[PDB]
Design a protein around this nucleic acid. Structure first.
Lengths: 46, 271
RNA sequence: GCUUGAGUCUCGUAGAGGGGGGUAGAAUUCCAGGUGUAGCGGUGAAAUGCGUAGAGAUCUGGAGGAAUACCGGUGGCGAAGGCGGCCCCCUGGACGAAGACUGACGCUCAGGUGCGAAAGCGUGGGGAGCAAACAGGAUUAGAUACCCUGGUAGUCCACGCC
RNA sequence: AGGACCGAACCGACUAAUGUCGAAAAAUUAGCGGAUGACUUGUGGCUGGGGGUGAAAGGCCAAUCAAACCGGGAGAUAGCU
RNA sequence: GCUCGCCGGAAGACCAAGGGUUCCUGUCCAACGUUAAUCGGGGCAGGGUGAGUCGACCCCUAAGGCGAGGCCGAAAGGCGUAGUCGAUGGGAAACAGGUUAAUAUUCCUGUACUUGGUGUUACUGCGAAGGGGGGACGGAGAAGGCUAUGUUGGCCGGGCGACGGUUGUCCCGGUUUAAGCGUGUAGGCUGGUUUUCCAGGCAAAUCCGGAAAAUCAAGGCUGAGGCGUGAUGACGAGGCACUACGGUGCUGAAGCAACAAAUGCCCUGCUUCCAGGAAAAGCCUCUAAGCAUCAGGUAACAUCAAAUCGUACCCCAAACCGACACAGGUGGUCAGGUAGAGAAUACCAAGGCGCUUGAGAGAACUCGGGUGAAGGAACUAGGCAAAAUGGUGCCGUAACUUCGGGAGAAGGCACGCUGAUAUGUAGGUGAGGUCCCUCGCGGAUGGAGCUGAAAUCAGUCGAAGAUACCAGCUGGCUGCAACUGUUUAUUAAAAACACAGCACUGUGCAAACACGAAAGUGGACGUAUACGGUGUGACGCCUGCCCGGUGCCGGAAGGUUAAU
RNA sequence: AAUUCCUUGUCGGGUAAGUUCCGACCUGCACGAAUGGCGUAAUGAUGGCCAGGCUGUCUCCACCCGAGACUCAGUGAAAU
RNA sequence: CUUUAAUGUUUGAUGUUCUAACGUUGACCCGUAAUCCGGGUUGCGGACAGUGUCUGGUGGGUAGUUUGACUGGGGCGGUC
RNA sequence: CGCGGGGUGGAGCAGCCUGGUAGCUCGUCGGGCUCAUAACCCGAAGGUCGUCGGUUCAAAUCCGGCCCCCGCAACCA
């Protein structure tokens, strides 16, 4: 059958990107926690 | 007229279409068109506020001159178009100054007839003039609610408003639903009924006929499950609760008239 | 060919003949209001119904639908069914007067075609009054009847069927 | 002309069989239904947790739905094992 | 390297998406591959992606998102105007061949095209976020004119043949050619040109629209293809030639005719029905605020610039998504020969594979299949499974009906090959010749060549001629739902849902209702022949009795009755 | 009867034999008129029954052809 | 004490008129090329409507919950 | 088997609850009306209160046993 992941980098960035996060307080708090945990892949990018 | 197709296929045996030879079989006037997006009954938030809205064939909005803000100028009917948005026909009317403005097409009006707007016009079907000059007991359509709004009532196929009495600054109207109403003395009305009078006999025929029109399937309340609708549940079609709307408010005979401001105008309510 | 048949033409006569479109007064019902007050209404009697939340009664005004007193007559018109307040437009038939004209084109008519009370049916409007079915009150041995209070279809309208 | 007939592409999934620690966390095979429409499909957006959407099964909402997932109250509570 | 076998509307050849060097070369074999491995999408080192014309970026805009002020909200934040983003959309311009171990419409050869900056010359009124035109559009269907493309014929070149015949109506291979420019065609749309006037186009206008005269009868626009040219050029079978034996170098014939013909193009057409079918810019055009010995606009020409990013390979799969080298899923484009209605199917071509475990044996039994004595559902929950029917043309065809159907009802007949009719007909296509002409890609006539059904008659072969693949099982009484359709993705496709239609009832527009603490939106840029809710469910004949209880509409006097 | 428990009710047709089916009889445990009643051409990957055709479904299996199974070499699991 | 009359006065209940509150999702103009919004003129309604606070009623639209035990297995009956 | 109600003149049914006095309609008998019937009018009579037993001064009644009728229940795996 057709699975649950038909990737498209445009939609991937439009709803999970950096600017996608830097738009809401909820988003800015998520990016806040990534730095708090000292993560390398803050968000999905290249 | 209202022609009926032969039963060559199941679903074609119950179709009656109104064919009008006066309809212009060409294209609409480009300078008076505007896009119009269907919404499926979604608000700003995005939820389906009103159900049964979707599908439908893409249409173009023919902006119609309701106000008739060009008084004292004669106008000639060029062609009878077809406006999908309206339930009635529209008439391409070109004034004396070389300007085309769409108007609702009255009953007795074919291609080639003349009309002028204002208090100086002749009492003839199609002319628009303030009600203080219109004879008491006349039959009009497209009555104005406000002196300059444009015409709000009786603007559908074959729907007219009968003027009952003219009392000073207020004229007692008699709407289609039977409700008597008063309106200002300077409001504009339009003689005769609205054309496309045989619209009521269109019997679509197929389920798709209503589908490409723009409506959706309405699921009955007895069919739904308990949490989905006030009715639901039961082992095989069981009812027993007083008929209510999808939100508990009891329908089938409960008045929801609550305006309080227009109580003063409404004389004799529909009975 | 002729002319007494039949038919056409010149001029008038009376008419609820037919269709569409307008309008008037009487009367009823209803709606709001004023006056005013205990019955009203009903019948053989009575009861249901309506009324002190104030009817009936009377007056002012208004919305409406249908039907057109008197004239009206074993009077008139049409093939028949059938059709009457008044008015306009379209139009048919009938008869009379004096002559002219075509010159038997006539009589009837199985099948075929059209029109055709009322009731009924169909799509969409309208609904005052009247009124099947229906409800109740009486009548009665019983009353799914006659009588009485209400009341849907229908009766009205345009277009079709029968 | 047609929600028209027959029949591939396409979408769907009625009967049977195999498979059931499979080739595969619903598929293959032999056939079936629709096939100009209420059709199918690509890309891109919108509606969200007592909310959404629903040709309505209480089905569907990232292999999870009579109330999703993750973190936090929280070492919840357990006369029970 | 030689055969066999398999896909060939794919298991072939290219883009988009998505991956991220898997592409190519040399070398290596511990680990990976379900085995071996000198092999490889594995390891190690190296090489490879070349653009003014492709795409993106860029200009424009849809859904929709964000959104200065502002409205609103306990804060957060929500909504939204001016605006600003946002392609799956519109908008400028390139084709052929050659070359690499891997890149090419990007490199080289040849030949062209588009838009701006700057400058000279000759002319000349130009000039906006404003207006007008343009862009600009639906489904379905029919026909004509063509090409891609293929078969055949002639031409050129090779061969004339390892078992009988084969110098001939003989066999094999090739017979390719673009963009641009020029002509402006089949065919499509629309009547042209001029003068005057105007409450119109929120200001103006010579532009558009409108109303009157004049004059001619054609003008303008659009437009695939063919033909010239591009091109005495490229490519080019096959030899000559040197083999590091992988291939290279050099040379080079013919290169035309007819016919068939698309789902491609003309067609963003034409006719018609209805459910009535994006926007904005580029582009063309008219002016205002103004600026005019200017600036600028138009045209020819010289010249400069056309940046940046992607470009390899996989792209119906061992490289994406399914944990895997997974019998699965994934949009678009080209898509040949014979038979055939066809992209079905069978067999083949181009091209690419033999699916990463093999070798013997020939037991029960399981899965996938074939045939089957006599019988024919006696099996069984039940004809589930298999079998059988199956094509075209023609004849023929019931009950019942809403008069469309039922119906392809059922039930039958003819099909091969050859000859003749007729050295292939009907018919289609159609050069040469002839004639005319408002002389060109013209019109009639004319008929060669090419191509080509089906039928009639006769003959002959087989047990069987729609001989294979492909390809309905039919009829009868009846329940339910009218019907096409939808639904439990992963056990339920149904009599459940929906449906057109009917009924009741709500709503007089700042509409009822709905989302939302609110604003604001949807309802509707619609307004009672309209919209919402509910019930039923085509259509036909109907739809009877009850207002006690419940709910609801109305009436308000009295009784009771909160806050104050 | 998609509704009848008692019931395989009773009668008739169908069959050698019929708890199902078709058609009627009304004693309707407990149908019934828009939570619609009664019919109906057509439609149906629908429910029930019948007749023909057709056959390995079965009577009763037999043989044959391929893929596993058995044997050999290599690699090399699992629930428990 | 009661029946009651004129005046004054005290609050309240109706009806009508008016304009200044307020509404104006009417017309027009300006900020401004901007259908939002604010202001300005004007027309129409008009001390209503609507909003806050208090209050009665309706209220499964929604939320948190209870609905016992013994029982010769549980339910029903029965009983405490 | 259990729960609840019932048994009353010839017939259909009150009264019972909250005990002492049994009522209503049709019906039966007799009379009248009419030529005769019915209908109608007048009048009287007519009931062991299913049955047995107990309690009370007193029982159709209140309680319990049995017979009969009636509605329901007669279950989940």
């Amino acid at each position: 059958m057709k699975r649950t992941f038909q990737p498209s980098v445009l939609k991937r960035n439009r709803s999970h990107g950096f600017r996608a996060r830097m738009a809401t307080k909820n988003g800015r708090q998520v990016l806040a926690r990534r730095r708090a945990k000292g993560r390398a892949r803050l968000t999905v990018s290249k | 007229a209202v022609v009926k197709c032969k039963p060559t296929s199941p679903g074609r045996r119950h179709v009656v279409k109104v064919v009008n030879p006066e309809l212009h079989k060409g294209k609409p006037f480009a300078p008076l068109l505007e896009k119009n997006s269907k919404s499926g009954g979604r608000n700003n938030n995005g939820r389906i506020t009103t159900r049964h809205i979707g599908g439908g064939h893409k249409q173009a909005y023919r902006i119609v001159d309701f106000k008739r803000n060009k008084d004292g100028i004669p106008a000639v009917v060029e062609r009878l178009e077809y406006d999908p948005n309206r339930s009635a026909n529209i008439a391409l009317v070109l004034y004396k100054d070389g300007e085309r403005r769409y108007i609702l097409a009255p009953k007795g009006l074919k291609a080639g007839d003349q009309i002028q707007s204002g208090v100086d016009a002749a009492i003839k079907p199609g002319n628009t003039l303030p009600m203080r000059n219109i004879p008491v007991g006349s039959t009009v359509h497209n009555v104005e609610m406000k002196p300059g709004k444009g015409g709000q009532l009786a603007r559908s196929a074959g729907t007219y408003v009968q003027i009952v009495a003219r009392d000073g600054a207020y004229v007692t109207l008699r709407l289609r639903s039977g409700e008597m109403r008063k309106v200002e003395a300077d409001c504009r009305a339009t003689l005769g009924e609205v054309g496309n009078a045989e619209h009521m006999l269109r019997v679509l025929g197929k389920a798709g006929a209503a589908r490409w029109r723009g409506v959706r399937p309405t699921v009955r309340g007895t069919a739904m499950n308990p949490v989905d609708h006030p009715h639901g549940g039961g082992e095989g079609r069981n009812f027993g609760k007083h008929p209510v709307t999808p939100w508990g408010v009891q329908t089938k005979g409960k008045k929801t008239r609550s305006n309080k401001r227009t109580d003063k105008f409404i004389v004799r309510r529909r009975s």
